[PDB]
Scaffold this active site. Structure first.
Site, PDB file in Angstrom:
ATOM      1  N   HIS A  16     -87.737 -58.371 -61.627  1.00 44.63           N
ATOM      2  CA  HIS A  16     -86.627 -58.103 -60.733  1.00 44.63           C
ATOM      3  C   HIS A  16     -85.448 -57.338 -61.297  1.00 44.63           C
ATOM      4  O   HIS A  16     -84.548 -57.024 -60.516  1.00 44.63           O
ATOM      5  CB  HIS A  16     -86.082 -59.401 -60.126  1.00 44.63           C
ATOM      6  CG  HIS A  16     -87.103 -60.180 -59.367  1.00 44.63           C
ATOM      7  ND1 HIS A  16     -87.768 -59.683 -58.263  1.00 44.63           N
ATOM      8  CD2 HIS A  16     -87.574 -61.434 -59.552  1.00 44.63           C
ATOM      9  CE1 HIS A  16     -88.600 -60.602 -57.804  1.00 44.63           C
ATOM     10  NE2 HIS A  16     -88.494 -61.677 -58.563  1.00 44.63           N
ATOM     11  N   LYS A  45     -99.008 -57.787 -55.493  1.00 42.18           N
ATOM     12  CA  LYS A  45     -97.877 -58.549 -54.987  1.00 42.18           C
ATOM     13  C   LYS A  45     -97.392 -57.930 -53.680  1.00 42.18           C
ATOM     14  O   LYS A  45     -97.089 -56.735 -53.649  1.00 42.18           O
ATOM     15  CB  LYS A  45     -96.732 -58.566 -55.991  1.00 42.18           C
ATOM     16  CG  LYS A  45     -95.654 -59.553 -55.573  1.00 42.18           C
ATOM     17  CD  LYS A  45     -94.597 -59.781 -56.637  1.00 42.18           C
ATOM     18  CE  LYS A  45     -93.614 -60.830 -56.174  1.00 42.18           C
ATOM     19  NZ  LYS A  45     -92.498 -60.988 -57.120  1.00 42.18           N
ATOM     20  N   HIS A 131     -84.512 -66.973 -60.451  1.00 45.49           N
ATOM     21  CA  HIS A 131     -85.185 -66.722 -59.185  1.00 45.49           C
ATOM     22  C   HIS A 131     -84.192 -66.043 -58.255  1.00 45.49           C
ATOM     23  O   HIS A 131     -82.987 -66.248 -58.380  1.00 45.49           O
ATOM     24  CB  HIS A 131     -85.614 -68.030 -58.494  1.00 45.49           C
ATOM     25  CG  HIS A 131     -86.779 -68.716 -59.134  1.00 45.49           C
ATOM     26  ND1 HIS A 131     -86.738 -70.037 -59.528  1.00 45.49           N
ATOM     27  CD2 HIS A 131     -88.028 -68.277 -59.418  1.00 45.49           C
ATOM     28  CE1 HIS A 131     -87.906 -70.376 -60.046  1.00 45.49           C
ATOM     29  NE2 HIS A 131     -88.706 -69.324 -59.994  1.00 45.49           N
ATOM     30  N   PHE A 132     -84.692 -65.293 -57.277  1.00 38.79           N
ATOM     31  CA  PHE A 132     -83.854 -64.964 -56.127  1.00 38.79           C
ATOM     32  C   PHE A 132     -83.808 -66.179 -55.185  1.00 38.79           C
ATOM     33  O   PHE A 132     -84.711 -67.022 -55.180  1.00 38.79           O
ATOM     34  CB  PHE A 132     -84.397 -63.765 -55.353  1.00 38.79           C
ATOM     35  CG  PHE A 132     -84.083 -62.421 -55.971  1.00 38.79           C
ATOM     36  CD1 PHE A 132     -82.793 -62.078 -56.342  1.00 38.79           C
ATOM     37  CD2 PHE A 132     -85.088 -61.490 -56.143  1.00 38.79           C
ATOM     38  CE1 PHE A 132     -82.527 -60.839 -56.888  1.00 38.79           C
ATOM     39  CE2 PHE A 132     -84.824 -60.252 -56.687  1.00 38.79           C
ATOM     40  CZ  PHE A 132     -83.542 -59.924 -57.059  1.00 38.79           C
TER      41      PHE A 132
END
Length: 134
Positions: A16, A45, A131-132
């Site tokens: 990310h 993904k 994490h988002f």
């Protein structure tokens, strides 16, 4: 599953954070950038967002506006400013190992979950995004 050789924070950065993206303005950006992620997967993904800011600026979100996480657990934070992002979405006909993506540049406030570093993470960054929110 996260490859166990990567910590939570490392896998967040791998998937990310792209601070040295210059071809992010290219319509091919996502197809190129997703390869390193998909190398650790058995199916392409489907969706992935990159944040294109210096690492320190992404990490500093962990000291910004604290908010409840979507999971109701942990500690989440919203960026003060909108950041440069790219949303990557797999094209309908793609099938591993041929994973082609649409690149959708944008700017948005990001929301990240942060936590104390793993012992395997650099001690230079004690509290890091993992994490988002979604």
């Amino acid at each position: 599953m996260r490859p166990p050789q990567f910590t939570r924070a490392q896998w967040f950065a791998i998937q990310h954070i792209d601070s040295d993206s210059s071809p992010s303005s290219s319509s091919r950006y996502c197809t190129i950038a997703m390869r390193a992620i998909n190398n650790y997967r058995w199916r392409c993904k489907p969706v992935n967002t990159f944040v294109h800011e210096p690492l320190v600026d992404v990490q500093n979100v962990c000291f910004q506006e604290k908010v409840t996480c979507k999971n109701g657990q942990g500690n989440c934070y919203r960026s003060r400013f909108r950041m440069h992002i790219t949303d990557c979405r797999l094209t309908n006909g793609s099938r591993y190992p041929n994973c082609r993506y649409r690149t959708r540049p944008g700017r948005r406030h990001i929301i990240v979950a942060c936590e104390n570093r793993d012992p395997r993470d650099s001690p230079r960054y004690p509290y890091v995004p993992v994490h988002f929110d979604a």
